[PDB]
Design a protein around this ligand. Structure first.
Ligand SMILES: CC[C@]1(O)C[C@@H]2CN(CCc3c([nH]c4ccccc34)[C@@](C(=O)OC)(c3cc4c(cc3OC)N(C)[C@H]3[C@@](O)(C(=O)OC)[C@H](OC(C)=O)[C@]5(CC)C=CCN6CC[C@]43[C@@H]65)C2)C1
Ligand SMILES: Nc1nc2c(ncn2[C@@H]2O[C@H](COP(=O)(O)OP(=O)(O)OP(=O)(O)O)[C@@H](O)[C@H]2O)c(=O)[nH]1
Ligand SMILES: Nc1nc2c(ncn2[C@@H]2O[C@H](COP(=O)(O)OP(=O)(O)O)[C@@H](O)[C@H]2O)c(=O)[nH]1
Ligand SMILES: [Ca+2]
Ligand SMILES: [Mg+2]
Ligand SMILES: [Mg+2]
Lengths: 331, 439, 428, 54
C-alpha cells in the first residue's frame, strides 16, 4: 500500500491522477501535512522541496522539478536562451526577445536592434511603435518581456485563421523525456487581420479568450487526426515531417539544457514533471517556441489517456503495482 | 605558535572528542601514554602540533581539552579508556544527574550548579597558553546538556574571553539514532542563544553520516562508534591546518575570514571524499578529479541538501595525500563546466586550496580503508538553510499545541523564550533566502 | 547510581510486587538469598538501580512492603524470594481496610503512613542520586488504593523534584464482584492524575480477556493474570536495568512519553502472549513481534487503539536479533498506519533493543503507548461510578469514615475532565 | 583559470584559484536571567508544597 498527499486542489490533471490511484486499491491518500507519504502532488508555489527525502523507510517522489521554473517564466526563458551556450544566441527557433523592467536587464538594447518589419508583442498588447508599449509596462508592476510578433503565421483554411500548438511532455525520475502522441491546436475562430494590431481578438489564440470575444472545429480545438489530414490536402506534407520533428527537437534542446541543474538522479528524493510546450507554425512551415508551462491543463477529450500515462510511466515505474501513448525522445 | 582549547560537552561531544583525540595521536605519533618520541624538544615547544598539545618535563604531550557532562557515565569511560593516561583528572568534569533531554534543565537548573567550576578548569588551561587563539566546541543539538549547558558556556566565554574565536562542531538530530522527541525544541533554543557567540559552526546531520556509513561502508545498522570514526576524519581534515605546517587556515580567525562574510550565516557545508570500505578487497584508487568531483555530490555532504539551488559565498578545498596543484586546477575547470556552481555577485567565483601530503590516517581495525589521497570541501552555501527549514517545521508542529512545553516551564524557562527563539530562526531563514535568489 | 525506591501496597500491590522482584532477580542473576550467580557482567552493570549492596556482597531489593493487614505480608515472607527483602522494610497493620478507600486514605491508613515514610526516608537518604519512586497497587480495594494514594501525596511532599511512577491495576466486574470498586478507582484516579508522572494502566479487564479468550484458560487465577503483569513489568523497566541509549531513566522516559502533565496514563502491551508452563517452541520473527505488540489483543488495557491516536510510543525488543530488521519493521508499522499517530508530534515512536532475553523466551517485545484511546478505560469506570453515585448508593460506607459526598462529585468531575482532554487531542 | 599566492613547504602547499571576479550581554545581565528563571522555579514549587499543605 503506497501513500500520497494532495497539496494542489486546483489542478485538474492531478485531480484525475489521484482518482486513478485510489481506484487501484494499492494507494491511499493522507492528510495534507502528514509526512509519511511516498508521493507528493505538490502546490504550484513555494513547494517545500527542502523537506522531501528525509523520511527513513520511505522512497519519496514529487510531481515537480525544483529549478524548472527557469524554463516556465518568460523572463527566465529569455535569460536561459540568451546566456546558455547549449541553446545560444544562435538559436534559430525562438523569437527575438528582450526583458524589460518598469521604471540587471536590457531595456536599452531592445530599441537598438529596433531602428534597423518592426512589429512586436508585450493582459497583453501588440504594436510597431515601441515608445507607447514601454509605457504599458511602466504602468504595470510586473517584469514584462517583449519579442517580435510573428508577422506571417500559417493560416488554416477554410477561414484564414491562426493557431498555436500545445504539446504535452512528461519527464520522469530517470530524466527520460516523453512526448504525448496527442497534441492540440488552439485555433482562432475569426479571420486574421494584418492591419491595425491592437485588437486582442484574432491574434491571441489562448482558449478562454475565445470563449469570450469570438464553429469550424469543436471548442476551437483541432486534434492531430484532423490537422494532419489538412496538411496532407492543402500543403501535401504530414504533421510528422513538416512540424513534429521540429517540435521534438526544441523539447529535447530545452530540457537537456537544464538537466544538470534539476536532475534528481543522485538526490535523496525523486522528481517527475508534466510540461506544456506551446509553439507557432509560420508560412514556411517553420516551428517556433512561444512558452513552456510548468502547471498545464489538459484538453477535455484527452485527460483519461494522458493522466493514465502519467501513472504508468512516472508513478508506477517507481512504485510497481500488481503500444505506448508516448514518444520517447532519446539522448 | 598559538594554542587552541577544545571543549567537549554532553555525551555526543565527549564521545566524538575521544574519537578526534585518538585520531590526533595517531597522526602526530603520540602514544596512548602521552609519549611522542618524534618530539626532540623535551618538556616544551612552539611546533604547530603544540597548538593542540601542551607538554610536561616527563615528555607527556597532553591535549588542551576539557570534557564536560552533567552525568558521569560517558566521561568515566574516558577516565578508564585506553587513553586514560593522556588526560589529567582536572580536565574531566561530571555531575550526578543529567539534563534529561531538557534544554531548560541543562541551561538554567543543572547548569548553574556547574558553570563556575567548568570556567575555572578552562581558566587553568588558558593560563598555560602563551597566545590562546580561542576554542573549538563539540556538542549535540538534541541533548539537554549538549544544547543547554553549551549555550550557557558560550555566553560566559564571550564575557571572559571577549576577543577569542569560538568554533563549533555541532551534531544535528536524526530520528534514526535520536533519543528524544523533543530534540527540535532543544536545537532551536540553543541555536538562538548561541548564534551571536559563535564565529563559525560546522554542522553534522547524523542522518547524512548514518547513510554514508550504510551505503559506502556496508554497515547495516551503524553505531555511534561507526558514526564517530567517520566524524573525526572530517573534523581532523578541518583542524589539520592548525596542527601542521602550512599557510592556509593557520589560525582560528582565518576560518571566519575565508568562510564567513556574514556573521549570522556562519554554517559552512562540509563534503568529504572518499569513504571506502576496509572490508573491500581493494578499491580502484580515486583520482584528484574524481574525489574533487565527489565534493559536489549531495550523498557525500555532512548535511543532505542541494547546493545547486542556493549560492556560494566561499569555498575551501582541503586535500590530504598524493596531490599537486596542477591536477587540482585541472579538476576544477572540468567541474566548473559540468556543474552549476553559482557564487553571489559580490563574490569572486573561486577556491582557496590547501594540500597536506600526509594521506589520511585511519584507525587500525576501523571501517575505513586507507587511501593515497582524500579531500574535504568547506563551502558556505545558502543551501544548508534546508536543514533550518526542516528543523523549524518540526518545532512549529509541536509548539502549536504546546506539546512538552510544561517540562521547560517547570524548569523556570518562560514560554516567551520559545517564540523568541523561533522568531530569530525565521529571521535566519529569510537572511539565507535574500542571499540566494537570482531565481 | 540513580536509584529507584520500590513501594508495594495492599494485597494486589504486594502480589504483583513480589512476582516483579522474583522475575527481575532471576534476570540479574540474583538468588533467593541475595547472592549473584550470573554469567554476563551485563546483569550487574545497573544492578544498583533496584538493589542495595551490602558487605557479604549481598544484594537487597530497594523495596518497601506496605499493608494494613498481615495476611499477604506473611504470604510474601514464605514465598520463594521472601528472604531477600529487608525485614525492617515490612511495614504492616492489623485492621485491614475492608475494600474501602476512605479507610486506606483517611482513618486506618493515616495511622500507619508515618512508619512507612520513615522506611522510605531511610532508603532515600541512602541514595547517591535518587531517580524517584515506583508503586504497585490496585485501585479497586482499600489499602493499595486509598493508602497507596496517600503515600504518593506524602512522598511527593517530601520529594517534590523526584519522579513518581505507578503500576496501577484497574478493577473489572469480569474478575471481581465487590460493588464499591468503581468508587475506590475513581477516588484514586483523581489522585493519580494530580500526583504521578507516569502510570501504567494494568486493566484486569484486559488481563482477563487475554487469559480466557486468547490463552484458553477457562478457570483463570490471579496467578495467571500476574504472569502477564510480571512479564509486562520486566519489559517496561528493561531500559532502566540494562545498559542502553533510550529512556534509560525515569525522567527521560517521562520527557519522551508525556506531552501534557495530566496525560500520563500508558497502555502497556506485550508479545508473545503465554501461559505459565506453556512451553515456547518457535521463537517469533521480528515481523511477528511487531504486528503483535501493536495488536489490540496484546494490550494490557482494555482499549481499542484504533479508536484513538498515539501521542507517543516506546517499543522495547529483547533477545538476539537483527537491529536492521527491527528498524525496518518499526518504520513499516508507522508508515503503514500513520493516521493513528498524531501528526503534530514528529518521530513520536522510539525503539530500544536489549540483547538479554527474558526467562523462557528467545524473542520478546514490550509496547508502551500513550494513546487517546485510554479514555475508554476511564469512561468505563465513570459509567459504573455514576450508576451508583446518582442514587448515593453504598455511600454510608464512606461518610461513616468522615468523607463528604462533595469529595465524590469532585473525583467524578476530575475524571470526566481527563476523558474530554484525551478527546481534545484525539481530534486536533 | 588564474593561480595565486602559492605557498609551499615540506608538509604541502596552499594557493587560491580564481575563476571569475564579482559582478552581547555582560556577566551581570546573565546572572539576572538565570536568577529570574530560578525564581520562577522556586515560586512554582512553593505553590505546590502549599497545595499539598491544604
Ligand atoms: C483471575 C481472578 C479470578 O479467579 C477470576 C474469576 C473470579 N475470581 C474468583 C474465582 C471464581 C470464578 N468463578 C467462581 C465461582 C464461584 C467461586 C469462585 C469463583 C471465575 C472462574 O474461574 O469461573 C469458572 C470467574 C468468575 C466470573 C467470570 C468468569 C470467571 O472465569 C471464567 N465472569 C466473567 C464473571 C461473571 O459475572 C460473568 O460471567 O459476567 C457476565 C460470572 O457470571 C456468570 C453468568 O457466569 C460470575 C460467576 C461466578 C458471577 C457473578 C460475578 N462474578 C464476577 C466475575 C465472574 C463471576 C474466575 C477471581
Ligand atoms: N554522532 C553522534 N551523535 C550522538 C552521539 N551521542 C548522542 N548523539 C546524538 O545527540 C543527541 C542526544 O544528545 P546527547 O549528546 O546524547 O545528550 P546530552 O548532551 O548528554 O544531554 P543529556 O543527556 O540530556 O543531559 C541525539 O540526537 C543523538 O543521536 C554520538 O556519540 N555520536
Ligand atoms: N491482577 C491482580 N489483581 C488483583 C490481585 N489481588 C487483588 N486484585 C484486584 O485488586 C482489587 C482488590 O483490591 P486489593 O488489592 O485486594 O485490596 P487492598 O488490599 O485493600 O489494597 C480487585 O480489583 C481485585 O481483582 C492480584 O494478585 N492480581
Ligand atoms: Ca616539543
Ligand atoms: Mg550523557
Ligand atoms: Mg482483596
Amino acid at each position: 500500500m503506497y501513500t500520497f498527499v494532495v497539496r494542489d486542489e486546483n489542478s485538474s490533471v492531478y485531480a484525475e491522477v489521484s482518482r486513478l490511484l485510489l481506484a487501484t486499491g494499492q494507494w491511499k491518500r493522507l492528510r495534507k501535512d502528514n509526512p509519511r507519504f511516498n508521493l507528493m502532488l505538490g502546490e504550484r508555489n513555494r513547494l517545500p522541496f527542502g523537506r522531501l527525502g528525509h523520511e527513513p523507510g520511505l522512497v519519496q517522489l514529487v510531481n515537480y522539478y525544483r529549478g524548472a521554473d527557469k524554463l516556465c517564466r518568460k523572463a527566465s526563458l529569455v535569460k536561459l536562451i540568451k546566456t546558455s551556450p547549449e541553446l545560444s544566441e544562435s538559436c534559430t527557433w525562438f523569437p527575438e526577445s528582450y526583458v524589460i523592467y518598469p521604471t540587471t536587464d536590457e531595456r536599452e538594447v531592445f530599441l537598438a536592434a529596433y531602428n534597423r518589419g518592426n512589429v512586436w508583442i508585450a493582459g497583453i498588447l501588440i504594436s510597431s511603435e515601441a515608445s507607447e508599449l514601454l509605457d504599458f509596462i511602466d504602468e504595470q508592476g510586473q517584469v514584462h518581456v517583449i519579442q517580435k510578433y510573428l508577422e506571417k503565421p500559417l493560416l488554416l483554411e477554410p477561414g484564414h485563421r491562426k493557431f498555436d500548438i500545445r504539446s504535452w511532455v512528461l519527464v520522469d525520475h530517470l530524466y527520460n523525456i516523453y512526448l504525448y502522441r496527442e497534441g492540440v491546436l488552439r485555433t482562432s475562430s475569426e479571420p486574421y487581420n494584418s492591419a491595425n494590431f491592437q485588437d486582442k481578438t484574432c491574434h491571441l489564440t489562448n482558449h478562454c479568450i475565445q470563449k469570450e470575444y469570438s464553429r469550424y472545429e469543436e471548442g476551437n480545438e483541432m486534434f492531430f487526426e484532423e490537422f494532419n489530414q489538412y496538411l496532407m490536402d492543402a500543403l501535401n506534407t504530414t504533421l510528422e515531417n513538416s512540424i513534429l520533428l521540429q517540435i521534438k527537437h526544441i523539447i529535447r534542446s530545452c530540457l537537456m539544457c537544464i538537466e544538470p541543474a534539476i536532475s534528481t538522479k543522485h538526490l535523496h528524493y525523486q522528481s517527475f514533471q508534466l510540461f506544456g510546450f506551446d509553439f507557432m507554425v509560420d508560412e514556411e512551415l517553420k516551428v517556433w517556441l512561444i512558452e513552456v508551462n510548468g502547471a498545464p491543463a489538459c484538453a477535455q477529450k484527452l485527460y483519461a489517456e494522458l493522466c493514465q500515462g502519467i501513472v504508468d510511466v512516472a508513478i508506477s515505474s517507481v512504485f510497481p503495482l500488481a503500444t505506448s501513448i508516448f514518444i520517447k525522445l532519446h539522448h | 605558535m598559538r594554542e587552541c582549547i577544545s571543549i567537549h560537552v554532553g555525551q555526543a561531544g565527549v564521545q566524538i572528542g575521544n574519537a578526534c583525540w585518538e585520531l590526533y595521536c595517531l597522526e602526530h605519533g603520540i602514544q596512548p601514554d602521552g609519549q611522542m618520541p618524534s618530539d626532540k624538544t623535551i618538556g616544551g615547544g612552539d611546533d604547530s602540533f603544540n597548538t593542540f598539545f601542551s607538554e610536561t618535563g616527563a615528555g607527556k604531550h597532553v591535549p588542551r581539552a576539557v570534557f564536560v557532562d552533567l552525568e558521569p557515565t560517558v566521561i568515566d569511560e574516558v577516565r578508564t579508556g585506553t587513553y586514560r593516561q593522556l588526560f589529567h583528572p582536572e580536565q574531566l568534569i561530571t555531575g550526578k544527574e543529567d539534563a534529561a533531554n531538557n534544554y531548560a534543565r541543562g541551561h538554567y537548573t543543572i547548569g548553574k550548579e556547574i558553570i563556575d567550576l567548568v570556567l575555572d578548569r578552562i581558566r587553568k588551561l588558558a593560563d598555560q597558553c602563551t597566545g590562546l587563539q580561542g576554542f573549538l566546541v563539540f556538542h549535540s543539538f538534541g541533548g539537554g546538556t549538549g544544547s543547554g549547558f553549551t549555550s550557557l558556556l558560550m555566553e560566559r566565554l564571550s564575557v571572559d574571553y571577549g576577543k577569542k574565536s569560538k568554533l563549533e562542531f555541532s551534531i544535528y538530530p536524526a530520528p534514526q539514532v535520536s533519543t528524544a522527541v523533543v530534540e527540535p525544541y532543544n536545537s532551536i533554543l540553543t541555536t538562538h542563544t548561541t548564534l551571536e557567540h559563535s564565529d563559525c559552526a560546522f554542522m553534522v546531520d547524523n542522518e547524512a553520516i548514518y547513510d554514508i556509513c550504510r551505503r559506502n561502508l556496508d554497515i547495516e545498522r551503524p553505531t555511534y562508534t561507526n558514526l564517530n570514526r567517520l566524524i573525526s576524519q572530517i573534523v581532523s581534515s578541518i583542524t589539520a591546518s592548525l596542527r601542521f605546517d602550512g599557510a592556509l587556515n593557520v589560525d582560528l580567525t582565518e576560518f571566519q575570514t575565508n568562510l564567513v562574510p556574514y556573521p549570522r550565516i556562519h554554517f559552512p557545508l562540509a563534503t568529504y571524499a572518499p569513504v571506502i570500505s576496509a572490508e573491500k578487497a581493494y578499491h580502484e584508487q580515486l583520482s584528484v578529479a574524481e574525489i574533487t568531483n565527489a565534493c559536489f555530490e549531495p550523498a557525500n555532504q555532512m548535511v543532505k541538501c542541494d547546493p545547486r539551488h542556493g549560492k556560494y559565498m566561499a569555498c575551501c578545498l582541503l586535500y590530504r595525500g598524493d596531490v599537486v596543484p596542477k591536477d587540482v586546477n585541472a579538476a576544477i575547470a572540468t567541474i566548473k563546466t559540468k556543474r552549476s556552481i553559482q557564487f553571489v555577485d559580490w563574490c569572486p567565483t573561486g577556491f582557496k586550496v590547501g594540500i597536506n601530503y600526509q594521506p589520511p590516517t585511519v584507525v587500525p581495525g576501523g571501517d575505513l580503508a586507507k587511501v593515497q589521497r582524500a579531500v574535504c570541501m568547506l563551502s558556505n552555501t545558502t543551501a544548508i538553510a534546508e536543514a533550518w527549514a526542516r528543523l523549524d517545521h518540526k518545532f512549529d508542529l509541536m509548539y502549536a499545541k504546546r506539546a512538552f512545553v510544561h517540562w521547560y516551564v517547570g524548569e523556570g524557562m518562560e514560554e516567551g523564550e520559545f517564540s523568541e527563539a523561533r522568531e530569530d530562526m525565521a529571521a535566519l531563514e529569510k537572511d539565507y533566502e535574500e542571499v540566494g535568489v537570482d531565481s | 547510581m540513580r536509584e529507584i525506591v520500590h513501594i508495594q501496597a495492599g494485597q494486589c500491590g504486594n502480589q504483583i510486587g513480589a512476582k516483579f522482584w522474583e522475575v527481575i532477580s532471576d534476570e540479574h542473576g540474583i538468588d533467593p538469598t541475595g547472592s549473584y550467580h550470573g554469567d554476563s557482567d551485563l546483569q550487574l552493570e545497573r544492578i544498583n538501580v533496584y538493589y542495595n549492596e551490602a558487605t557479604g556482597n549481598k544484594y537487597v531489593p530497594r523495596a518497601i512492603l506496605v499493608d494494613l493487614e498481615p495476611g499477604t505480608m506473611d504470604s510474601v515472607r514464605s514465598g520463594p524470594f521472601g528472604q531477600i527483602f529487608r525485614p525492617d522494610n515490612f511495614v504492616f497493620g492489623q485492621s485491614g481496610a475492608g475494600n474501602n478507600w476512605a479507610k486506606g486514605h483517611y482513618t486506618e491508613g493515616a495511622e500507619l503512613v508515618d512508619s512507612v515514610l520513615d522506611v522510605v526516608r531511610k532508603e532515600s537518604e541512602s541514595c547517591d542520586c535518587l531517580q524517584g519512586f515506583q508503586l504497585t497497587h490496585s485501585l479497586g480495594g482499600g489499602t493499595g488504593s486509598g493508602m497507596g494514594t496517600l503515600l504518593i501525596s506524602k512522598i511527593r511532599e517530601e520529594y517534590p523534584d523526584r519522579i513518581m511512577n505507578t503500576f496501577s491495576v484497574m478493577p473489572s466486574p469480569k474478575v471481581s464482584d465487590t460493588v464499591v470498586e468503581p468508587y475506590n478507582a475513581t477516588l484514586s484516579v483523581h489522585q493519580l492524575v494530580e500526583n504521578t508522572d507516569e502510570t501504567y494502566c494494568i486493566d484486569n479487564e484486559a488481563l482477563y480477556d487475554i487469559c480466557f479468550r486468547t490463552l484458553k484458560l477457562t478457570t483463570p487465577t490471579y496467578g495467571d493474570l500476574n504472569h502477564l503483569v510480571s512479564a509486562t513489568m520486566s519489559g517496561v523497566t528493561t531500559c532502566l536495568r540494562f545498559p542502553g541509549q533510550l529512556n534509560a531513566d525515569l525522567r527521560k522516559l517521562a520527557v519522551n512519553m508525556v506531552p501534557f502533565p495530566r496525560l500520563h496514563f500508558f497502555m502497556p502491551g506485550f508479545a508473545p502472549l503465554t501461559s505459565r508452563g506453556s512451553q515456547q517452541y518457535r521463537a517469533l520473527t521480528v515481523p511477528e513481534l511487531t504486528q503483535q505488540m501493536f495488536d489490540s489483543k496484546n494490550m494490557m488495557a482494555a482499549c481499542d487503539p484504533r479508536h484513538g491516536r498515539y501521542l507517543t510510543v516506546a517499543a522495547i525488543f529483547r533477545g538476539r536479533m537483527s537491529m536492521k530488521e527491527v528498524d525496518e519493521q518499526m518504520l513499516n508499522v508507522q508508515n503503514k498506519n500513520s493516521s493513528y499517530f498524531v501528526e503534530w508530534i514528529p518521530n513520536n515512536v522510539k525503539t530500544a533493543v536489549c540483547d538479554i532475553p527474558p526467562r523462557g523466551l528467545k524473542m520478546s517485545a514490550t509496547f508502551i503507548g500513550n494513546s487517546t484511546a485510554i479514555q475508554e478505560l476511564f469512561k468505563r469506570i465513570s459509567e459504573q461510578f455514576t450508576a451508583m453515585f446518582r442514587r448515593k448508593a453504598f455511600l454510608h460506607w464512606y461518610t461513616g469514615e468522615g468523607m463528604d459526598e462533595m469529595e465524590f462529585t469532585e473525583a467524578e468531575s476530575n475524571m470526566n475532565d481527563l476523558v474530554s482532554e484525551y478527546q481534545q487531542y484525539q481530534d486536533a | 583559470m588564474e593561480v595565486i599566492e602559492l605557498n609551499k613547504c615540506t608538509s604541502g602547499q596552499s594557493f587560491e584559484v580564481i575563476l571569475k571576479p564579482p559582478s552581547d550581554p555582560s556577566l551581570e545581565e546573565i546572572q539576572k536571567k538565570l536568577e529570574a528563571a530560578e525564581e520562577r522555579r522556586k515560586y512554582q514549587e512553593a505553590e505546590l508544597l502549599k497545595h499539598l499543605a491544604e
